[PDB]
Amino acid sequence: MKYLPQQDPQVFAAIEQERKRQHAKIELIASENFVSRAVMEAQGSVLTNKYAEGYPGRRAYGGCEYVDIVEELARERAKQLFGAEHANVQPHSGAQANMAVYFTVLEHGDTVLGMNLSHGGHLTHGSPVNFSGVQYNFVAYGVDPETHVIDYDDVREKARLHRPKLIVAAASAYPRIIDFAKFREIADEVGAYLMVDMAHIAGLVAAGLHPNPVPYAHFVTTTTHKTLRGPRGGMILCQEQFAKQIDKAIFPGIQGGPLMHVIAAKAVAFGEALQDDFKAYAKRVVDNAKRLASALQNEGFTLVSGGTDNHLLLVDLRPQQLTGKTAEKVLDEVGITVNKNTIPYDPESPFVTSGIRIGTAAVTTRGFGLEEMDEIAAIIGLVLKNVGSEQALEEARQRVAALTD
Amino acid sequence: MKYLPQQDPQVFAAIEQERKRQHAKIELIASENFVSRAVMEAQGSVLTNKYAEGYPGRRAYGGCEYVDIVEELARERAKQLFGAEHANVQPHSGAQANMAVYFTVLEHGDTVLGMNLSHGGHLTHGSPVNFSGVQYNFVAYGVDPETHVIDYDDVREKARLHRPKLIVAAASAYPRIIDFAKFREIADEVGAYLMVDMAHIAGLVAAGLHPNPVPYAHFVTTTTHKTLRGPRGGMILCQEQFAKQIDKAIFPGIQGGPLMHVIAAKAVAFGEALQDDFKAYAKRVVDNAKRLASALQNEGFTLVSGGTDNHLLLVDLRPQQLTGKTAEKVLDEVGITVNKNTIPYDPESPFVTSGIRIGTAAVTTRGFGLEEMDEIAAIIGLVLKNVGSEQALEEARQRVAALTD
Ligand SMILES: *Cc1c(COP(=O)(O)O)cnc(C)c1O
Ligand SMILES: *Cc1c(COP(=O)(O)O)cnc(C)c1O
Structure with a gap:
C-alpha cells in the first residue's frame, strides 16, 4: 500500500x-481461506465508482460498457465451472443469494424444509432469529443419531407430512457428501422446488471432488468465498426457466447497485478455479x-x-x-x-x-x-x-x- | 496493479x-463520485479473508481483535460525523440498510408512508417490484404541482388517513432541503417512527450544508458512497434505545458475514469527511x-x-x-x-x-x-x-x- x-x-x-x-x-x-493478490487488486479497483443497477446490456444508467464485460466474464466463467444454464453474480453475500431465491419462489408464511440447524444447517435455513425463520415456516430433517449421515427417509417423511414449497439441501457443518439425486427425487414426489446451498463445498464441486448439485437443483446458491477461494460475496445458479425471475429477485427485488469491483474479483476467482492447479489444490x-x-x-x-x-x-x-x-x-x-x-x-x-x-x-x-x-x-x-x-x-x-x- | x-x-x-x-x-x-486511493487500498486489503459475524468484542469467531479495531473506528468516526448515538456500519448497501430498519420496526403488511417514487422517492421506499412494496403496505405523499416542494400538509393528511407505523423521509431525486422537524412533528401526531434515508445528501449533512436528520429521526439510513464519497455500502444511525434491535436486524437478521475490507474503507472515508478540506469540497x-x-x-x-x-x-x-x-x-x-x-x-x-x-x-x-x-x-x-x-x-x-x- x-x-x-x-x-x-x-x-x-x-x-x-x-x-x-x-x-x-x-x-x-x-x-x-486466503485469496490471491489478483483477486484483492480487482476489489481495490476504480470499479467501486460505477453505478450499474440492472444487468449487462440492460442497465439503468449509461456508461456500463466495460463493467458489462466484467460481469459477463463472471457469469460465463461461472457457467463454465458449474455447468449451469444461468448465473447471477450480483448477490452481496451468501445470505443475499439465499434471500433472493426465497423471494423468487416463496410467499410470506410458505413452508420450507431444510437441514436441522444443530445437525449442520445454516442460519439462513430457518433460524427463528434470521429473516428465513421469521418470513417462512421452516421445518427440519435430521441426521441419523449413530452415523450422523442425513437420514433420507426423514427428509422424505418431513416432506410428505409438511408439504413444503421448497426443500433446501446443503450445510455449514456437514462432513459427508450430500446425495442431491435423492433430494430431487423427494422434491419431485411432493412437488417442491429444490434449492442447494453449496457455499461450503463450492470449490470442491468446481474441482469435481464433490457431486455437482446443478443437474439436480432448480436453484443453487453459494458464497464466492470459502472453498471456492474467491472474494466475499454471493452467487445464484439456476435453470434457464428461472433466469428472468432470479435476476428480478436480485434487482429490483432485494438489492440496489451491485458491487462491480467485487464482481471483477469474482471473475478473477472463477478464472483461477478453471485452471488445472486449482483442481490440484482442491484435491x-x-x-x-x-x-x-x-x-x-x-x-x-x-x-x-x-x-x-x-x-x-x-x-x-x-x-x-x-x-x-x-x-x-x-x-x-x-x-x-x-x-x-x-x-x-x-x-x-x-x-x-x-x-x-x-x-x-x-x-x-x-x-x-x-x-x-x-x-x-x-x-x-x-x-x-x-x-x-x-x-x-x-x-x-x-x-x-x-x-x- | x-x-x-x-x-x-x-x-x-x-x-x-x-x-x-x-x-x-x-x-x-x-x-x-470518485473515491480516494486510500479508500480503494482499504477495499483491496487482506481483510476480505476474515469472517467476523457478530459485533466488536461479541463475535462468533476468534481472531477478530484487529478487525474489531477497524469496525470501531468506522462506528466512532460515523458518530463524530453525524452526532448519532449508535452506528451500524455492516450494511452491504443502502438497500440492505433500509431492509434492516424495516425488519426492525415492521411486521409483514404494516403500512409505511414514503415519498412518491415519481416525485423523488427511492425504489426501496415502496416500489411494487421491490421487497419494500411487496412486504409492506406503502402509501405516498407528494410534492406541490407548481413548486415541486414536498407538500407537508399532504404528508400530514396521508399520515392521519393511513396511520402508518413508519414514515420515510428522503429521496434520490429531490433538489431541495427536506424539513426533518416537520416530518418528526407529523410522525409524533400519528404515533409513527420516523426513518430518514439520507443516502444522496449524506456528504452535505456531514459538512453542515444540509440540516442533520439525526436529532429528529429514530433511524437514519444511508449509503457510504454518493456525496459522502466513501466505498460502496450502507450504514444505519439510530438512537441508543434501538441499538440492540438494529444490530440484531443486520445480524443475525438479514445479513451473514460483514465485508470487513469495505468497513475498513468506510472508516477511511469517514476519516476524510471529518477533515476541513471535505467541508470545503462539499461547499x-x-x-x-x-x-x-x-x-x-x-x-x-x-x-x-x-x-x-x-x-x-x-x-x-x-x-x-x-x-x-x-x-x-x-x-x-x-x-x-x-x-x-x-x-x-x-x-x-x-x-x-x-x-x-x-x-x-x-x-x-x-x-x-x-x-x-x-x-x-x-x-x-x-x-x-x-x-x-x-x-x-x-x-x-x-x-x-x-x-x-
Ligand atoms: C457461509 C454460508 C452462508 C452465508 O454467506 P454470507 O456471505 O456469510 O452471508 C449461507 N449458507 C451457507 C451454507 C454458508 O455456508
Ligand atoms: C442510492 C440509494 C439507495 C440504495 O443504495 P444501494 O447501495 O444502491 O442499495 C437507497 N436509498 C436512497 C435514498 C438512495 O439514494
Whole structure:
C-alpha cells in the first residue's frame, strides 16, 4: 500500500496487525481461506465508482460498457465451472443469494424444509432469529443419531407430512457428501422446488471432488468465498426457466447497485478455479482433511460421522469431557483458530456446544500437506489432553510457530 | 496493479477501459463520485479473508481483535460525523440498510408512508417490484404541482388517513432541503417512527450544508458512497434505545458475514469527511450545483422546483419537446453522462420520462468549479437545442474533451 499509510495511520496499523495475524496463526475455521493478490487488486479497483443497477446490456444508467464485460466474464466463467444454464453474480453475500431465491419462489408464511440447524444447517435455513425463520415456516430433517449421515427417509417423511414449497439441501457443518439425486427425487414426489446451498463445498464441486448439485437443483446458491477461494460475496445458479425471475429477485427485488469491483474479483476467482492447479489444490484440501481426521482419531478423538468426505470435520468432545467453548478458548491461547460448533443431538446450547469444527481449505492454500496435518493433530491432542498445563500450552505455542515459520 | 495484469488479461483490460472512461467522460449522474486511493487500498486489503459475524468484542469467531479495531473506528468516526448515538456500519448497501430498519420496526403488511417514487422517492421506499412494496403496505405523499416542494400538509393528511407505523423521509431525486422537524412533528401526531434515508445528501449533512436528520429521526439510513464519497455500502444511525434491535436486524437478521475490507474503507472515508478540506469540497459541490442550475436556466432550460438547495437538479424537458430518454441518449453521444428521470407529475413512463437528473459531486471531486459549470450548461444547451445536427454534436464532443483534458 502507498496512500493508506499516510492518509489513515489508525486504519493502516490495524490492517497490518490483521495481515500479520493471518500469517502467524493456524487457521482451521472451515469457512476461511486466503485469496490471491489478483483477486484483492480487482476489489481495490476504480470499479467501486460505477453505478450499474440492472444487468449487462440492460442497465439503468449509461456508461456500463466495460463493467458489462466484467460481469459477463463472471457469469460465463461461472457457467463454465458449474455447468449451469444461468448465473447471477450480483448477490452481496451468501445470505443475499439465499434471500433472493426465497423471494423468487416463496410467499410470506410458505413452508420450507431444510437441514436441522444443530445437525449442520445454516442460519439462513430457518433460524427463528434470521429473516428465513421469521418470513417462512421452516421445518427440519435430521441426521441419523449413530452415523450422523442425513437420514433420507426423514427428509422424505418431513416432506410428505409438511408439504413444503421448497426443500433446501446443503450445510455449514456437514462432513459427508450430500446425495442431491435423492433430494430431487423427494422434491419431485411432493412437488417442491429444490434449492442447494453449496457455499461450503463450492470449490470442491468446481474441482469435481464433490457431486455437482446443478443437474439436480432448480436453484443453487453459494458464497464466492470459502472453498471456492474467491472474494466475499454471493452467487445464484439456476435453470434457464428461472433466469428472468432470479435476476428480478436480485434487482429490483432485494438489492440496489451491485458491487462491480467485487464482481471483477469474482471473475478473477472463477478464472483461477478453471485452471488445472486449482483442481490440484482442491484435491489437497480433501486429502488433507482425510489425513487430519485420521490423525485426530489416532490421537484418540471421536469425529462426527466417523470422518470426512470433504474439507471439514467435527470433533465430538464428549469423550474428553470438554465443551466446544473450552476447546476453542484454549486452542486460541496457542495460536490455533477453530470454532465451537454444535454436534448432532448436542446436549449443550449453541453458545457452549460439545464440538469444534475444523476445515483444511486455508492451511492448504498456505501450502500445508499431510505431514503438517499429522503435526496439527498432535498439537491439538497435546493441548486438549493437558488444558491445565501451561508447560504443555507453551510447547504447543512453539510447535504452532514452527509450522507458520 | 501488479498481479492482476498477468493473472487475468481479460479482467484487467476491461478495468483499464473503465478507468480511462471515468477520466474521459463528464460524470453528471447525481449518485456518482470518485473515491480516494486510500479508500480503494482499504477495499483491496487482506481483510476480505476474515469472517467476523457478530459485533466488536461479541463475535462468533476468534481472531477478530484487529478487525474489531477497524469496525470501531468506522462506528466512532460515523458518530463524530453525524452526532448519532449508535452506528451500524455492516450494511452491504443502502438497500440492505433500509431492509434492516424495516425488519426492525415492521411486521409483514404494516403500512409505511414514503415519498412518491415519481416525485423523488427511492425504489426501496415502496416500489411494487421491490421487497419494500411487496412486504409492506406503502402509501405516498407528494410534492406541490407548481413548486415541486414536498407538500407537508399532504404528508400530514396521508399520515392521519393511513396511520402508518413508519414514515420515510428522503429521496434520490429531490433538489431541495427536506424539513426533518416537520416530518418528526407529523410522525409524533400519528404515533409513527420516523426513518430518514439520507443516502444522496449524506456528504452535505456531514459538512453542515444540509440540516442533520439525526436529532429528529429514530433511524437514519444511508449509503457510504454518493456525496459522502466513501466505498460502496450502507450504514444505519439510530438512537441508543434501538441499538440492540438494529444490530440484531443486520445480524443475525438479514445479513451473514460483514465485508470487513469495505468497513475498513468506510472508516477511511469517514476519516476524510471529518477533515476541513471535505467541508470545503462539499461547499463547492453545492455552489457548483447552484451555478449549474443558474447557467442551465440562462440557456433557457426549466428546472424542477426552479433550482436546487443541494448537489442535484432536474431538468424538465417538456418546453423543448424532448423526453429524458432522448436527452440521455444524445448527451451520451458527446461524452456527458446523465440519467433520464421522472419529474413530478410526469406524463411519461419511468422508462421514457420528461426529465434528466444532474448532480455535481463527481465533477467537483475532479476539481471542476464555477467556470466549468457555465461551460457544461452551454454544452448541454448546444446539444439539446441541436439534436439533429452532427456538426453541433461534434463541437460538443470537442468541448467535452477540452474539459476533461
Ligand atoms: C457461509 C454460508 C452462508 C452465508 O454467506 P454470507 O456471505 O456469510 O452471508 C449461507 N449458507 C451457507 C451454507 C454458508 O455456508
Ligand atoms: C442510492 C440509494 C439507495 C440504495 O443504495 P444501494 O447501495 O444502491 O442499495 C437507497 N436509498 C436512497 C435514498 C438512495 O439514494
